[PDB]
Design a protein around this ligand. Sequence first.
Ligand SMILES: O=C(O)[C@@H](CO)OP(=O)(O)O
Ligand SMILES: O=C(O)[C@@H](CO)OP(=O)(O)O
Ligand SMILES: [Mg+2]
Ligand SMILES: [Mg+2]
Ligand SMILES: [Mg+2]
Ligand SMILES: [Mg+2]
Lengths: 424, 423
Amino acid sequence: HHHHMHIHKIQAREILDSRGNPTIEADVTLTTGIIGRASVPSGASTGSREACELRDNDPKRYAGKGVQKAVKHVNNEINQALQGLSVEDQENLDRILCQLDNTENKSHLGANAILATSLACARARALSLNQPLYMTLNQGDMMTMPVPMMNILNGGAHADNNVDIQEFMIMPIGAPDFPVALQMGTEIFHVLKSVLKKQGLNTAVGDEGGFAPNIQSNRQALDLLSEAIEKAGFRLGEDIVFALDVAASELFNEGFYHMYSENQKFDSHQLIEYYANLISSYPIVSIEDGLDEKDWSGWKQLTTHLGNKVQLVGDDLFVTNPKILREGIAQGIANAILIKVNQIGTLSETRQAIKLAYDNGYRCVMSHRSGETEDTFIADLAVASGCGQIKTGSLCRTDRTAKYNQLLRINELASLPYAGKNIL
Amino acid sequence: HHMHIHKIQAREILDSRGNPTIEADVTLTTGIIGRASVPSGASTGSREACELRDNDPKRYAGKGVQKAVKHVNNEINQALQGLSVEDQENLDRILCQLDNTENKSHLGANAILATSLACARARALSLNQPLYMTLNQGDMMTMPVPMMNILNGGAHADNNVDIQEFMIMPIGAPDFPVALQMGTEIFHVLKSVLKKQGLNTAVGDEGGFAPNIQSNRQALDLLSEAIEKAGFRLGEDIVFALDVAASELFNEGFYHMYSENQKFDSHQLIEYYANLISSYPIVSIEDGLDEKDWSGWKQLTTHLGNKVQLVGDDLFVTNPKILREGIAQGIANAILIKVNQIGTLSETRQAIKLAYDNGYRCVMSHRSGETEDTFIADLAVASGCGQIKTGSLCRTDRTAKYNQLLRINELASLPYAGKNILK
Ligand SMILES: O=C(O)[C@@H](CO)OP(=O)(O)O
Ligand SMILES: O=C(O)[C@@H](CO)OP(=O)(O)O
Ligand SMILES: [Mg+2]
Ligand SMILES: [Mg+2]
Ligand SMILES: [Mg+2]
Ligand SMILES: [Mg+2]
């Protein structure tokens, strides 16, 4: 009976994210007693146009980072609005949530309250259908196991070091399947630990599980990764390529981009030249947020000059927002979008962004936040969307490895191809 | 009939340090699936049950667990299919007898434990009851006081710190959510304290900061400064616990405190702890002496056991036969409970009951190599042990356990162990 998908109760609680800050988790209980659960990640280098992450700002609790207000909105307004409604229709539930909040940026209820509900409803739906979550998320796209971009040297807002570029990533594009891709990245990660240790560089880790050494230059970081790849027995280019998340909005100040580690400051034109030179020296296949979120003329120049040679991922540029991505497509800016469910606040709006990207030749990279939880939703969503690329961290910290493990579980019975070099 | 096993299977997953470990799914004839994964230590005791690895240099630098996975998929599945998960003791008996070795070196303790815990979860799902409820064996349950390792050293971090774990315990909190809040607030203040002194705030394996230190006293001074700046009171609100992991420091008749350019014989190291305890509110010392230093442990227990909790970790490796001998010799007064040091839930329960029956406390513990599995949260509550050691306040390998304790606390209606752990 289809009344078995009707909501009995929605509740929320405050839990800790992987940096030790509060975040929200929601339980959707159906009339059958089935419970869908989901928790919400939290960024550090957040774009200025991300949907509202509602915090309490009570200095006596968690230094102002409590989320009891968002929890209360789930327990009260959201529960009352959704009780008796079916989780079978994700678009309708998400529509009701957005209409209930009735603000452009989800600043009344909180995007974290809304997203916790949205994702917990999706899980309640899958449980009701008695199907794996990734199957119930698919909207017709050919599913693949994604190529992971693995952030094994952390910098910027994610680490206590002098590194300006936020993320230095390896991508095991040459692996035959996903389990071997994970093995290759893990083996390189452990070799890199030894390479850093032999050079007296720090091997404690930053927020996403990458090592946090101080570096002489961005080229030194790429040299260290290259040395670990070689010592692990793999081939640059054929087996492993590089991806960067510069998070350049964090470096932009007073009309210039500041590479403090190299005592360099660049205008947009100079920074594009800098990337062109990096790409000619290293097999970098993707650069995320190479320019500031407001530098739309720079992004257009970057896309014209290098977009045929490299993937150009908008993160803070688009904030998983269909209306912004639409304008970017119209202006020919970037050629990929980083998909972060909590930048926009609902599964349905995330799907709108994915569809708009696919329909216009943009790739999607499914992404964690730097403040993660035990929730592995993005592993299922990455496979279901067929985006072929996932960004979910280094090879240590369970906030990252839990996603890789969930992909291993999916791979077991999915009988799906590995996206491999098709992502190029 | 709903508790009969249809199938058991395993898979290789990654632990929180990036090394392979094993996860098992137990499928009942009703289709209910219990799942559990197995943690892995770094500073392992010499007498821990066998963690079976593949030793294939082509895969994961020899650390794959496909051999253990195969033992679950084949030998263990065939031995258990048809049997009931309702009787945990019976299943664990059958697994140990199937292995037929003292140290579980045939099937692997990791294969056996993954099955043991997965069966426990399948049983709980079959009863439609919270896991912690189905694990209780009559003890009064409490929400445990967490000892929170916020400054990592020893085998868990790339720094000069010899002591493995510097922990705070929010013994003065009114309930568990506030206890977690206090530890978290102190953790973030400690980050600011370290940053202001130019000390490293990247983290070690258990999520504590990994700075270099001038001395163990400086580390305790830094924690004290963070406690004070966070607005809490030493002694009344927050006390300290240490895991020295002294077996890692012991060599050729001496304990080596390289960070302090000093070495100690057993007698001298006991004096060293006496002086630390007089200067700081240290209420617990874990593995203060080497796992084989049985005369030192006796002296330590006689001299300081009435002043401080003395936790055997590598000393006992969660092993009832070893703990029984330690009790008879009067060594230590608490035991660190690590399910994968012994390999079954039933043998773990034997160690807990032996400790309880002889007035020893139990501290439910993670390993430094963790997974997303939160079993020890439910087991800590169900056992009523009142103390849990499951990491700093960052890394989901640690926070997932704290979060599970928050979930249990919602409908459990249980007291917080609080200062009662000192009695
Ligand atoms: O910028 C990013 O892409 C993310 C993920 O690595 O970091 P943050 O969540 O801090 O925005
Ligand atoms: O010694 C310990 O108590 C544990 C947990 O901190 O560490 P390891 O798992 O490496 O043995
Ligand atoms: Mg960011
Ligand atoms: Mg980014
Ligand atoms: Mg140890
Ligand atoms: Mg120990």
